[PDB]
């Protein structure tokens, strides 16, 4: 399971060479850049039981159909898995987002994701819905400027979104 | 392979986990669940801006 | 018991020649033991580790908590093996696990 | 491949959990960690042949015999098979050090060092002693936080073969 | 689910052993017992409107608080899903009955009742409130032995949430 | 695994609403013909090995070829194997005369057996062949008048018939 | 997939993941020393078969007098052909085990499942013990030496498994 | 899992049949022979790192690309793998050469090795010409005659050569 | 209790092998932030009183009803028992700051949590907002990396509570 | 299994009070002297195989029945064994230096080692006096202060004779 230096490293030993200068480069920048990383993820660290709340209220309200006798979320049982789904979403996706490769989804979450929801009958698209609304939820607690010192980081934005996204894809 | 003392894991590098690929409970259909054509006929309970 | 059972069959597996470590050190399984049922932390990881490899972290839910197994781990008096095999065979594992399939 | 970041992660999913206070304090360590790292790197990856010259010299110095005909290492081709190995190993050293783990040094050269050396007759006092060198070498490249680290990278490998 | 039949179906399954002298008198205590059980669920059946109601209100009466604004109780949706929850409880309860076994309520609403209740904030007390309004009022609707099984399964449910 | 209760409280909470009277009122009627339901399966339960026997006596009879060597029930194995199916089928079906619903039977029994009667080469056709002997067999018993109070049984003679029906067209 | 000397040695060799060491070839040397003796003793044993079964079939119904009756297992040509084929089945088999120089065919083709066939069917172990006890007495004169012994421990094996 | 003496005996039973006066002839030559045979697989024992080396040498002086970076065999556990799926090949054609049958050479190795290796990456042809490779080494010390008796090895030779042509076809 | 340093020795001493790099410098990490966080911990060591005081009325303002008679908050010597439970949340938020882990706090408060909880009827919200006051106030107290370090602390309390 | 902060922590709970300014203070004069104590471990890390070799050596050198057959350490194996146990105390040695506590010495092993040692027969004298000479050897080891920045290193060589005498002394 692969981070940025690890996948870095990996690419290089393929081509059978040294690290470039250039790569180098990068990646001290990364790790440059690394106290952002790690205050964002603590973020979604912090925040995910206010994000998966906010993502289950929306998707209910949304989505009734889920939540009627016979629903996918009916019972309070099943209702339960849903929201442990989320939680696992989100969290690989901070995983991810510490390590600054998306290997972490792909593997160990992601890699046979849709098979599964269709043999449970979960309807797939509902799911990515959630994946969304955590990413939406996510975002604002992202951007929280207090207690933390003010900057720039709008790459670990896109880069959070595009986790989420992948995850909502790769479901969807 | 585990003896006595030790909590079984799986034998594989993890990359490809199990518990993810095999639910429990694969292509069946389930008395309490209802089919995905289908639709809920019962009290509805409230109209929120339908 | 009775008859004897079928021939295995066997097929070429990774589990079966591994002489050499696995690829990476990270995704290799965590192999909980004895020792980590002596701290108290430790041994909640371990208890839920265990649910997680039987029960597949979706049922973990308080009402399919085996509280007994768990307190008679928590003494001493309950081997890993005798742990595990409580917890096959268990109503929860039975009825969530055995009836659908 | 192990890391820092990756056995912080390894660890949070095992126990099912999001990573708490000390996986991120671990994490800011590396972070910090890097740059002297990186510039160990660096100067090890400049000075790449002059080091592969030294240790591959050092080790027919060492063992005379080898070179002679009748022996392992005599040849043009298993001399130049020589000199490519121990750039293999330099250059996993080197990726040791900017990964700031041991995960590449343990995934390519000491997954399966000894069988590997048992099969083709090489004798790891060989790679020892070239490490040796690489060691004396990098004592006067290096100084500082990047000399702990790359001899650090390198007293691992040594371990490792021995 | 799990009933009296199906527990001892389930038990002769697990040691693969035909149902014995044992489990049929099970059965025939369970068989005996279904006309009271049969009673009871059509009589909290019928008065369905007036115990969810009645729930409701008492819900409402020994917590006023939650009804005030930015509370849980505000808002016609709320009560709405309050007076939706209760007829969950009391159709789970009048399943069981019929069932005459936990099952039911053990399996669409004991199981995961801690998750959803802490994930969406829900006091448990409200509900055990609900559930003690329905306990009085069906020693007034009930007489006897279904009055007993009624209470035996609404005791369950308030053991379950408290 | 479901009974006849329990099938009924699933379809009702599918629809979402209460028992009507009618269900209760059918629930009522099994529960007051339970008891003659008990003496059946009791009746299959105690008679097992005598079911057993005559139909694989039956069964060798009508069907030589089984017993020759390079048949499927030759060897002392093989033949342990017939009677010990026979043996299990017998018993999922007193347990689905108990319940009242072929689901458990169906279900724990039936569902995959066909493939794995295939995959062993085993001819499905003398399966079904000997569950019908032991439907013969077993309906010999379940009519036993002595020893019990007499009355009309006919409904559970057809159910368990149903039973023993399913099972074959199953198999084969 | 019978249990035999070789295929003992290579199963024990690789459950342990290794090559056959000296001792494994050195049974191995032992089982191929056995099979001439074996061979020597089913030649002799298929080759009087018919005798054999003909004289145990009797000598069970001799030492069981009451199965002959009217109303018991005995009655009837049928069951006589049965019994003939029963006792021709385990000489068969016997002969199986002397060749492979084991007890796999008898362990697999008769032994397992005998008791659950004979509850079954209501048969009685003691009438094939005493047939193969009739056998067991016409190859202590057919055989000589080391062959009589190597077909003693397989029909004993059998006696043993019934009882 | 069968020696040739466990064919001989199935085939036989298969059809019902005691064994035959030239059946029993064959197997007593094959017993005779068995020291022939124990030469041979005491042979391929002994001498199995020998043999390993030396099929491993000419397979990576004839192809580099393994163990060049970016190669099958190069990362240096991929090298340990290579050496340890020839000397699990060389002890499973030694243990049908000691049993006389190609059976457990094609149940507990080969049953599903060649959709593992396609799933690896690994080149399928190069895997067979190592293992005919190993054939061409071992076939060398199966004929040395120092310390043992002179003889006819032919058909010992042919069998040898029948075994680890079977495992290099079923990889390829 | 857990620490950086308990984690690193148990988890040597579990392969039964020595120390490797990255737990030595992840305890020089650790050993490193030991400066902030005792600063941290005297900061919050001087003020307990104050915020203790703060913590019960900022309970009382955000949940009014449980002062009124009948309820768990009515009567002296249960305002006596929260002010309390909130020394003791704080003492051990000053203990995971000395500790530079959560081990006093899980093994302290969060071992055993919720069924002690709801066997007392406490309900979690009181110490959840009541923790949230105490993090408003080290928003004024601390300052720096400590300043941080604090707050994570209680966040991690917050996590276990919800 | 305690730390020196776990210690203070643990008697402050007992106490009942919060951490005393003098205990901070303390615990503050520990951490600043933190590189010290890590140098120290990772160099007794580093260096562990040549102390063990060393120890080996002498204790072959100074006790003479040993290494005869009939002695507690003839048999290989049981070299490999005797290695293994200075291996693991002179680890313990080194978890208690880096911990500060000698709590991670005392219960882990010590307990059992006791009557594992009486059991055995092994005498325990020979024992703590391998541990002090082993202890000689690594001090030698730890005077070395080369490739590393030079500075005062009493107080750890003080902890570490401690510790060393407190496993003999349990051991004795
Ligand atoms: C490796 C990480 C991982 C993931 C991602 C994962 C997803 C996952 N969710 C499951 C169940 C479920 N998942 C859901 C989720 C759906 N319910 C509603 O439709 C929502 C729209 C939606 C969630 C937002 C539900 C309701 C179940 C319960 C199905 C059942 O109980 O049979 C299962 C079946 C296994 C089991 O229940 O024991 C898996 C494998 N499992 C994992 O180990
Ligand atoms: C103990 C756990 C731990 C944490 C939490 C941590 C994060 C951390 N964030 C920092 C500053 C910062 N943090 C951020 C990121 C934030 N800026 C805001 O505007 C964004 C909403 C948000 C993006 C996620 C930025 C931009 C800085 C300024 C310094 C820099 O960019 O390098 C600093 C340096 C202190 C300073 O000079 O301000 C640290 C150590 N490090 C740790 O060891
Ligand atoms: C007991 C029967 C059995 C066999 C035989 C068997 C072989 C086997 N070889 C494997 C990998 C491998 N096999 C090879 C060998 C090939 N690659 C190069 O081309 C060489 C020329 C060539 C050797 C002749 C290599 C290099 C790998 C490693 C692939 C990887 O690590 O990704 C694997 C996948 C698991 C692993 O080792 O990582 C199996 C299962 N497994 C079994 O259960
Ligand atoms: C990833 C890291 C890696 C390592 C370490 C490695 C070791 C390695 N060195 C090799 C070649 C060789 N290596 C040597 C030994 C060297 N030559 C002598 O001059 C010196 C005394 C000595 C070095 C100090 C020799 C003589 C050969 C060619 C002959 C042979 O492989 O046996 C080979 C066999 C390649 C082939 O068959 O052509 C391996 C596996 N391979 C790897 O992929
Ligand atoms: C199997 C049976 C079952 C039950 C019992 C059940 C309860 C339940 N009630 C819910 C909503 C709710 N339920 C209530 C109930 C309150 N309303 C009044 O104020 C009262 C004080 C109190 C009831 C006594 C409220 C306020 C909500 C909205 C909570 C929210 O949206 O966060 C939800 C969240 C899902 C949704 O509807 O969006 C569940 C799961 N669900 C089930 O599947
Ligand atoms: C692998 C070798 C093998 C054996 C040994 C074997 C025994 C065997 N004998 C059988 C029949 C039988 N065999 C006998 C034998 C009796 N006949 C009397 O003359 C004697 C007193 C006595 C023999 C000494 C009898 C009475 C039956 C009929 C039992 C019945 O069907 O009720 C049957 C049931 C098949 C059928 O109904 O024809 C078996 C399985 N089967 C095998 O495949
Ligand atoms: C509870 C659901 C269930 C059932 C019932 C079931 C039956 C079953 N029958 C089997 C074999 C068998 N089944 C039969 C019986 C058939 N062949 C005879 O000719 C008869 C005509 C006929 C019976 C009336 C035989 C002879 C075998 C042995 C096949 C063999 O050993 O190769 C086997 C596998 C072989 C073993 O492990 O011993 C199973 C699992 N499996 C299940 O999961
Ligand atoms: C301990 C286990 C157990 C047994 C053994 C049992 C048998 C049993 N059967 C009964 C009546 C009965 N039993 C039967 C069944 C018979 N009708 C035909 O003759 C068939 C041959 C046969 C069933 C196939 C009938 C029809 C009744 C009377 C039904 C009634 O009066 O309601 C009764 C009650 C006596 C009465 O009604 O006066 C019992 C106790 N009940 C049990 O709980
Ligand atoms: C330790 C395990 C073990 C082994 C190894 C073994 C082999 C073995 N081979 C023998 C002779 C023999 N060995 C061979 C085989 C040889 N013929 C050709 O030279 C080939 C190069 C070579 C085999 C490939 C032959 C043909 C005989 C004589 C058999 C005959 O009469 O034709 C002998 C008898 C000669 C004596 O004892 O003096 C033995 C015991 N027996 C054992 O218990
Ligand atoms: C070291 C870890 C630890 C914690 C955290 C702790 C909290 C704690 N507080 C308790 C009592 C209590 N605590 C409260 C305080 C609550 N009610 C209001 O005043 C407030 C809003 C609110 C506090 C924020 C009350 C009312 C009780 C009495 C409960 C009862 O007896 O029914 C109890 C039960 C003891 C008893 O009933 O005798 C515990 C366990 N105790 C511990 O040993
Ligand atoms: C019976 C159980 C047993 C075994 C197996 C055993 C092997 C063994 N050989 C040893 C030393 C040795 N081993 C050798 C032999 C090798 N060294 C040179 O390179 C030679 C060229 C080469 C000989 C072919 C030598 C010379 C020593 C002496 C080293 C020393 O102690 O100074 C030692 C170190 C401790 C000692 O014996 O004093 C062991 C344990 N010892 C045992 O008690
Ligand atoms: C929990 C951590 C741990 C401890 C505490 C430990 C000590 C220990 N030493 C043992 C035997 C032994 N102990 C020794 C060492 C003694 N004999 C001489 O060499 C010396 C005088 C002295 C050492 C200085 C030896 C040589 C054995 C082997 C006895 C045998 O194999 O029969 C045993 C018995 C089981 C075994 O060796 O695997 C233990 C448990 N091992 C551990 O894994
Ligand atoms: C990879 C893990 C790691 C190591 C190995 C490490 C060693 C280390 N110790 C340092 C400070 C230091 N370290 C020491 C300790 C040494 N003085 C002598 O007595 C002994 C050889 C030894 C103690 C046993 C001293 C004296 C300093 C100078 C700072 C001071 O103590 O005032 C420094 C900073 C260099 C500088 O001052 O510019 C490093 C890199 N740090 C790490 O994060």
Redesign the pocket.
Known sequence: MNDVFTRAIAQADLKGSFLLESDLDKLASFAKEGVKRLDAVAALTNNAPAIISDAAHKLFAEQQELIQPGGNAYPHRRMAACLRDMEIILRYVSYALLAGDASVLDDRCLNGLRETYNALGTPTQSVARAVQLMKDAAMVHLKSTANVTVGDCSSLYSEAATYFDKAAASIA | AFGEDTLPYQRRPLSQPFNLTTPRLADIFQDDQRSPWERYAGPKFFVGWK | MGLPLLDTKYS???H??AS?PA?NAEDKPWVLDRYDLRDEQGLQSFIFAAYRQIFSEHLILESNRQTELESQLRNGKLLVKDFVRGLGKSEVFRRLVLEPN | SRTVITEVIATADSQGRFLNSTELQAAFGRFERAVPAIEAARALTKNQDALVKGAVQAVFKKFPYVTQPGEKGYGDSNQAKCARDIGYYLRFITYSLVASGTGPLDDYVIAGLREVNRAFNLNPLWYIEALNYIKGETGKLLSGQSKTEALLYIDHAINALS
Request: charged content about 30%; glycine content about 0%; aromatic content about 0%.
């Open positions: 070429s597996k990774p079966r020649v050499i690829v």
